Give the backbone structure.
Amino acid sequence: RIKLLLECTECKRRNYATEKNKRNTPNKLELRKYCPWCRKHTVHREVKI
Amino acid sequence: PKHGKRYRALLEKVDPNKIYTIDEAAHLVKELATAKFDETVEVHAKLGIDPRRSDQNVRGTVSLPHGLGKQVRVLAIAKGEKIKEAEEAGADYVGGEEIIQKILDGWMDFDAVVATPDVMGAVGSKLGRILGPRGLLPNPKAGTVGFNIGEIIREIKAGRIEFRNDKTGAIHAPVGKASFPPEKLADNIRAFIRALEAHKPEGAKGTFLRSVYVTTTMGPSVRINPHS
Amino acid sequence: MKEGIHPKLVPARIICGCGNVIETYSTKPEIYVEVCSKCHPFYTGQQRFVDTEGRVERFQRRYGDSYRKGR
RNA sequence: GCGGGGGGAACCUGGGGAACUGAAACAUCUCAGUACCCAGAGGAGAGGAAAGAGAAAUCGACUCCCUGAGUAGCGGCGAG
RNA sequence: GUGUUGGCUCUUGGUCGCGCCUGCGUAGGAUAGGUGGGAGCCUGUGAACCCCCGCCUCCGGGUGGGGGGGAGGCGCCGGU
RNA sequence: GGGCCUGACUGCGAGGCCUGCAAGCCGAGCAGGGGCGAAAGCCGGGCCUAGUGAACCGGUGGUCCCGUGUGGAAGGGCCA
């Protein structure tokens, strides 16, 4: 609940990967990167609330 | 029980008990009105949306094929070759960021703006502040931005007709001429049926196409069952 | 016996309780109310031939009285 | 002019129906439908020819024994 | 809530179906409620000239009717 | 202190720290896959030793394994 809230990454409808994260400083701003098991690596994106 | 319209005769033609169907419509409308010049029939309708929360606000355009020449002007904003392509295609207003500048000044004669990704920055940011909530600024999935300035303005001239639910959830568009073949009025009524149907935002819950009809300019008004 | 029905048997048992729910909603069953009770109908009447009664019980009643009404 | 009723060690059907102890606490749960109050038919009642089984184009009343797995599963999925 | 627990009745509310009637921040001949068709429309007023009468108001005005008669008016055009 | 960037990657790990239980903890190197240099190579979060919680129960994003004759489905098995 504190400026620490948990989100996780999903990628262009072709997978979703996880990991927690925060809230503080740049808040929402949430692209990021990561690589799904989609294809061999691939952008992914991240975001996903 | 007597009213203020000579249209009264045409009204007698008008027997509002049935919502009938499309082709029937082409015929009875074509017959219904040929007053001064030849009828400029149109179709109009209302959908179970909620345009306040723009999460359903729709618009775009299907491609009701059939020669053209009138309605909804557009600005082809780009550079040389694009001015070429779209201008020729079928443009009412043509130029580029120079036209954009002219507009910032005091010239705006186009409802819809279509600019190619080459003067799109100048269009959207220079003229962003100008075209604004008028509906005159380019948007990447509002049939208003992209390289096919020629293709889109082209259809603007060969046959266009767009979509845009107004305040209360309704659209209007040309889907057949007056003296125009009945089957034709039918087909266009259709292309509109479809593109509209597509536009149908996922924010609808139930009886979406609520009222779907064909009415003319100054003339009859009858619903049509776009099913048959 | 002195209060079953008249038009069959509806005089007896009842084990029951509850506690709380919240199942195919969000979880398991707030389970418990080890309780026991009664459970039955009602009374009324009509006439043979000048001077009568009925007594009986509820529904079975209604259809029935209709029946001997037939006679 | 009939019948019952009144019994009866245990078995028996239905009627109504409990704490312990376990769950090393204990409120779901548990012992259990067990103990006990009852009504009643017997010499034994009980059940007893399928709106059954079960999925093979299969069986064929009901009851009791061995087996079916203590698996299939029921659950503060815990004692059980 | 519902079951025996039947009769007549005064009535008042929400809802959707159709009908009517409405919309004055401001330049705006003008109280434009939108968004469509979109330069023409109409003569059972032979007319916007005049007459009263029905109705809704932010002076105005909008709208619906009865009449009175002698090619007329307005939407266009423009313009805000 | 500046530049560029996501591996604070999935599949995984041989072999050890400690520990009776479960824990928790250290990790070369092989694969897919990228990123910092041209590269000799570093990167499977931080300079490290605390920011942690079984099991049940149930949720959601899968999956597209199971379905109590068969097609589907309530429902449900493993992943995250």
